[model samples]
Target: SPEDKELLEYLQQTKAKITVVGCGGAGNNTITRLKMEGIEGAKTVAINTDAQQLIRTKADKKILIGKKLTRGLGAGGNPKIGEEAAKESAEEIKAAIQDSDMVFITCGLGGGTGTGSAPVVAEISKKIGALTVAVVTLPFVMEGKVRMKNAMEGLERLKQHTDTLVVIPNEKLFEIVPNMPLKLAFKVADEVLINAVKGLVELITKDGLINVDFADVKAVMNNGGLAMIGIGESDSEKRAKEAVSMALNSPLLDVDIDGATGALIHVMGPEDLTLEEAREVVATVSSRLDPNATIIYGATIDENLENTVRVLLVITGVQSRIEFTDTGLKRK
Candidate 1:
């Protein structure tokens, strides 16, 4: 029994060993939804410049920074305060990160805590051998150049340090879901972001009908570049086509899919899935991606899927720029 228990905890200890951290107010809000999502065996932590904000967020753990300066009142959009707080709390932050094999840092750029501390957490996680991915959101176009500039600075640092960086712009909401009210629109962005995160998490942690080489994931993400993700689900007779179509055509991406330098595709469906259908899915995904880039893929069966198929696509080395043009974009 003792031997079995050790074996059990070893599996538990290694089950993903993944942690998703929300670095500020908006980032904490994203974590709220992620807290309830189906990302099995991953840990969630919430960090804030304000102690009360940390208290309110749904997470397994919380970190509050800047007691002497902000006094938990919040960073008030001051990157200096955010950086200082993160510095003061670096030990606690690193402690949460120490046990992870993979870590995701989520934040909203243009703010103090998220903008300032994300790179700090990312660097620490990366330095310790955890595969680090930074997921951030840019302010809307109307938020003005200051917020835009702030997001760009944040993105730059994250891209420089993290293994893979993903940026979602808030302004794209109107283009993606036209006529949706602001309340509902923000909801869509959150949902899409969550689905993208969940999609990648699924592939890395779960073995499907066909196992993907973990080496494949390391090869793609280890390049230290930008990546964009799209996800789709369908239960129709043409579900494979429908899912791949949704991923290729997602409005979240502003760059050409064929321009990516690397790509990873994953498909999930029921036992009824056919070899022909799998071939179609891979061919379709391949056709939409860069011809010269390395492509890695896998498929798994889920009896619960019934007639449905879920497609998740991650395209790396997307078209990018060195700096923002004060246009409120982190670039695709």
Candidate 2:
């Protein structure tokens, strides 16, 4: 056990490069939050048709693909505009992700930019060899049936190429952002995106308190299949307790953490949960399973629901981090 712990620690020391891809307003917000988190070796890139929108983001790099399509457009336009942008952005995205250790593509799924572009980007990453991850926000139930359909279709296309998928509900934002100004609502959304990215990066880069090798985390995540959700609420204690029970007893499936090297926990809700209470639950669960699996939690406030907390556990069996060079792909 001690040797395993030492091995995981060594893996954490390896540098990781993360790339964030987003579009539209949501994309801008996601990039802003990610930059705020201060990733060590990470570089974020925002892709969109609107040069103005991309320019407003805090990403380290930006690519404008929909410039032509968005030209002279008013409120309503042809979906073909997004399709054309996706085609152009796909080329740039394919190149940007070639050397990344980890990649996060975030957008409002089922809409123009995110829905059309994310799938293309994911396909290129898988082909080029990268640990690709997607953090997509689904449309609210009321955003319209057509958007919901688009969201489902977009998710289906993305699943075929990405390593991990984290879905957040945009409708959930309305519940959390009530009375808050549009500007503040955007601010809150950006914060949620930050929490998700930070939680994931920490698991790969941090040591101690149970470290899981990046490779192992990837393996476990692969075994669990695609599509995972991150839930956060105020009552982290109860939420953690319920999560543990669900993990251990739920008939859906038993996820084995025996080989986990590192883990990231994210809690987002309307209020802050008792940190000590949450940690206690994590400690209890860690002890019950393998004690060597490193665990980290990131929190955000979502004033939409009550006592709503969630845990998305991705366990991997690989013993080390997956390097870009490992998969011989053409670099741009």
Please tell me which predicted candidate would have the highest lDDT against the true structure: 1
Query: In terms of TM-score, how similar is model 1 to the real structure?
Result: 0.86
Candidate 1 — which residues are off by over 4 angstroms? 1-16, 269-278, 300-308, 319-323, 329-332
Give the alpha carbon lDDT tens digit for every residue of 17-84 in model 1. Answer: 88888888877887777786546557888899887888788888888876788878888887767877
Off by over 4 Å in 2: 1-13, 72-80, 172-188, 233-280, 283-332
Question: What's the lDDT for all of these models?
Answer: 0.76, 0.57
The count of residue-pair clashes in candidate 1 stands at 2
* Maximum-TM-score candidate: 1
Model 2, 1-332: lDDT tens per residue?
A: 99999998687555566677775556656777767656544677777666666666787777777655676231132234565677765767678777766677777765676677777777776676667787766655545677677667676677677776666555556654575654566566566666556556655554423444666655545432333333333344466567545533322112334444444554433455556545744665466434665554444443354767554443333222221111111111
Clashing pairs in 1: 208-300, 209-300
Give the C-alpha lDDT of model 1.
Answer: 0.76
